Write a structure and sequence with these properties.
homotetramer; 339 residues; alpha/beta; seven-stranded parallel β-sheet; globular; hydrolase; betaine-homocysteine methyltransferase
Chain lengths: 339, 341, 339, 339
Amino acid sequence: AKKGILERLNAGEIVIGDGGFVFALEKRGYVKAGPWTPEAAVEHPEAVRQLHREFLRAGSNVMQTFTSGQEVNEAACDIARQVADEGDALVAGGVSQTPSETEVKKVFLQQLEVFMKKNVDFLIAEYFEHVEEAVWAVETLIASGKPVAATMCIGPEGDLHGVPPGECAVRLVKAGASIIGVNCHFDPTISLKTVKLMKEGLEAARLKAHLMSQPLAYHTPDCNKQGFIDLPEFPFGLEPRVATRWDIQKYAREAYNLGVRYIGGCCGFEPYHIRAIAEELAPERGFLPPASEKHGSWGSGLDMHTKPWVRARARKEYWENLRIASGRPYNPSMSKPDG
Amino acid sequence: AKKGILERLNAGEIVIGDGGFVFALEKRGYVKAGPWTPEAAVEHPEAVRQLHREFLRAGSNVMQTFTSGQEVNEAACDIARQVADEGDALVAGGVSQTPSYSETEVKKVFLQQLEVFMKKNVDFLIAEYFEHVEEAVWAVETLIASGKPVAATMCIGPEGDLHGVPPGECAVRLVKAGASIIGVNCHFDPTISLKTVKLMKEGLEAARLKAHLMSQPLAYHTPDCNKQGFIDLPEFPFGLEPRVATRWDIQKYAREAYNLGVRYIGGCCGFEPYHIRAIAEELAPERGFLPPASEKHGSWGSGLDMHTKPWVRARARKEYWENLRIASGRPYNPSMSKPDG
Amino acid sequence: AKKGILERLNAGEIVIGDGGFVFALEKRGYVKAGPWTPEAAVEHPEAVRQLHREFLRAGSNVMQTFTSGQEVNEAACDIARQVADEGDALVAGGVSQTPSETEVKKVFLQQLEVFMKKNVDFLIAEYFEHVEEAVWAVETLIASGKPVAATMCIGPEGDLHGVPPGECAVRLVKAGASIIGVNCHFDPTISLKTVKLMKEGLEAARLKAHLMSQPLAYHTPDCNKQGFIDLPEFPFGLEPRVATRWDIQKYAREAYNLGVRYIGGCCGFEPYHIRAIAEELAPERGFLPPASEKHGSWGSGLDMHTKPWVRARARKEYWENLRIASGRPYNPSMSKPDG
Amino acid sequence: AKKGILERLNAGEIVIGDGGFVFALEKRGYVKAGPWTPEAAVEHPEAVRQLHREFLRAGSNVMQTFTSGQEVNEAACDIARQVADEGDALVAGGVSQTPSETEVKKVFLQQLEVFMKKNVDFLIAEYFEHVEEAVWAVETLIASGKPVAATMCIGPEGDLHGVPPGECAVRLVKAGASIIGVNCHFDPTISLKTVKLMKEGLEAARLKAHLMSQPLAYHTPDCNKQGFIDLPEFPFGLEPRVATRWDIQKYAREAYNLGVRYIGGCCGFEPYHIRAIAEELAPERGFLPPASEKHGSWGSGLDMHTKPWVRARARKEYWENLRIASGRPYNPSMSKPDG
């Protein structure tokens, strides 16, 4: 009786997605930074499995596959299915930007072949800068008869061709995508600007769909149209920009009020970020994730402490209004994109 | 033929220690922040085991155990021994400050703890988290009875212990108690920690009391910390993400500690497998080898030479990342904060 | 043979204007912050005269008057004329917003009476949030037969009514204003965005005019549409935001390349800022201001020093590429507008 | 009946000193940055006189002279005496580091000759890195029979030889100096650390003297023992570091509680900073300075605005507990000294 993705969304439930998986495996020594290739699926099944289980414990209702050769993709799907069966989670399929229509759809169908062999609960089109290739992806994938979702790494200023977010969203829903939204390249506020534009565009064309936000965990108020790749700090300097469990716990509420129901996360997101999403959205979802056992609510777990200040740090007010410090006073608070 | 801790140190080798274990299991949902209890050792052996293995892959030569009650400590020791046997690493024992503070009862707690680590036959012991040096000396005394190498660390800054005992006096008093390795752990970022360790080195040289030096600093940057370390910063525990070091800051602390004469170069709260991998990759040309996890990393961002853009391809060199002045990304935030305490 | 404002501009010359005059008399104890009244013109003629002479020495070619009641304005104009005659400067007239068309034009005409009595070389309409009142300004003032200039404190998002900057510019030039531009409420980059929009709008309608930039000396990258006044630091907290002689020496070149020829400054501008404008624009103007005798070019005057670092600070490269430090690490580098 | 410096101090009164005079005339175009020479005293007597009068209006009770050769010094003393006679102020002499004891005392005596001709109400030894030359100064100057004061630009880590500040202070009191303190090179907080050490050292030796503080107006938390001159921002990049009228109103209270009664200011201090000192210390001195007429108390003058927030900014609570913003988010909040 595992409800499908569209059944959950249409019922009005929040479908929390897993965080940045290929970024969490790079800091854990299994992915390399620059090829970002998922060999660890076959080389280190225990690492990939444990990250999946940590995300499931956090509150993710989706186990996106970590996708030698198609053997790696297969093994990734078996690990994802194994972990998904342990909880209220759905295995998802992911198709990403190809590095002509005939060849792009060739690549996309060869990829989709594996996800059909493995019977993934639903599919995702993601990492798409251009929306032309994104609609090609939604077309090639909805032939499966499985729910398809389309995400782009495009800011409020539209795709690389220049197509505005609203036009991109309506073009994706037209192609068949039952869920649409933004992933990667921008922090949880610019992303929710793009998703609001997408909602408005879909309401303009009366093209009902489900909304989906998977932003960066980093703060990038100094990013140009080219996301956070062009920041001088990418990839090995973004530790300061990482969000806290309060920033993400604010983006969860923002995205919920904006009308997003597939509230997840991308590069920089960790299990505790996803737990922040789940704990924020708990009073609507009617439950708390498993990992909430190893956590209070708004730092409520520190109100048995030996010091008065650390004891008083345990409340929503303190952590919501606190202005955390960079700890790097010889560094600027913003940087010019290199590109 | 697994060399012991003192054999490695006396041979001149660097003994890289594991990073903040309790802190890395809190962000992974297995430890709670505030009780900081290792209830995950029996509840989630796979999580603790995988963190141990990630640290081992990073380059750690020490699996400090993740230490009802004695059952949890035992299970932690079996997991640590399991992972240690998979590589060139040693299980370490850890005894820490008691919540109380008389000699007979503190040494009672210390001996009961030491019983389990004797049962499990840990390769060496650590006295750590000691604000006072009186209790740290008690620790070295109670633990060296094992006949195993004992190490002593305190979370004390350049201004001495809570009683005001200067770091050099602390180092001398610990080495006198029998501790073959002494150092500093926690409560301060790498530079303040390595200032304290410089003071300890000088103090030991003053009394001609030879010992091995050890540094397990915070991964956070805390230039605004008072004598009470990072715990009194308003951001602790759930606001320290900005302060987290990069693989370049830790890769600088590794060289600083090596030049300072520290050979047990590890890490504490905030340290992650990639930080320990930074330590190992920095100290590689001396150790004569690179850690396993270097297979999934270039040297100074070299792996980004593949990229399709010139401003992400030229990022692949020592100069760029060693001289880059990274940005906080929070321009509506101060770069420093006043300790609440 | 003192060339008029329009003769200077039409000849292609740069007409450097004076800096923030009532803000520089508040830090000198003669103006009060909050009423911002020019009572000091009759109470302290020597202070107002010396500030005028400092600006004239800096390089200003415009001695805007520091304008009971009409007596104070007359005294201000006498001092301005006295100091203008000492150099290559023109006395300018200033009409500003009134705290119906008939009553507003009444106020404007009563003001203009004094400036006609004193025969000011040209007039300025300035500090106009709305462009409905600014066209009334240009209308009421061009009846003098004197050159009239119109400025608003409006950002790139238009006036308070919502009129875009380009429409404001064309509507001011239609009213008769021979010079148009922006003054106050934004730093020297947002201001030069608005002036770029004004140039573009004038070129859209073929409505030739002269451009004029009088920006804030403060840095306000965190300002909303209500200028710098709504920042929490206004008025007594803006010392950190103050520009250096390099920031202003860069805005001078920006405004020159943008096509602005009346390059001056508003609140926060000091004699050394105007001297920075003049020294930057010197190679075109063909000369240097008097105050350059007490200054080097890009810190060249520090070549005398005994220390090697302070000696090497004497370069264009060093001072143009240096990221100066706030010196307040317990302070945020940006702030949310209170309004 | 103009009370002398020692009569005021011994009576328990606060003797507010003028601010950075050479530095204020550099921003006004009359002094050059790098030679820092006073030739404006004869070239521009009106500028020097107006700066003197602005400082006197602020609340300064001392009119330190602005000291072609000794003619410049005589003109400076004449202007200082002229302005001093207009209020409750005292002309003060000043001797600074030379660029052997016999030759140093020769130069110091040649200086003191002019101040004896002009009859300056008291003398100051200042800008002394070394305490050897500083005690030589106090020796050569106390022969005048006039009160002598000694200040050094030395931080909490002692003079350049290494003499601790307590030893410096006692060595200066022994030489005869009736007032001792610190001037320049450090912000108001480090300076007051040094003055605390001097007070403690004098109390160690039972060597009673009057305490004096003339700190920088800049914030320099990132300065090493060589003061602010070694910062990369010196001289033309210190605008961000400038203190506000609230920071100086805090330093005034600090110095008063520390036991300092000659509370003034060095480089970076302006008439409004000295007015901040005077307004802060008013409820003890029993009066407010003249310039307080053009100022409220803790921003009270903004009660007249039309906006609720700009009206509510008028509060001690608001301006005392406000973290002002640098407005430069692409710049670090601290910088490494270049020396």
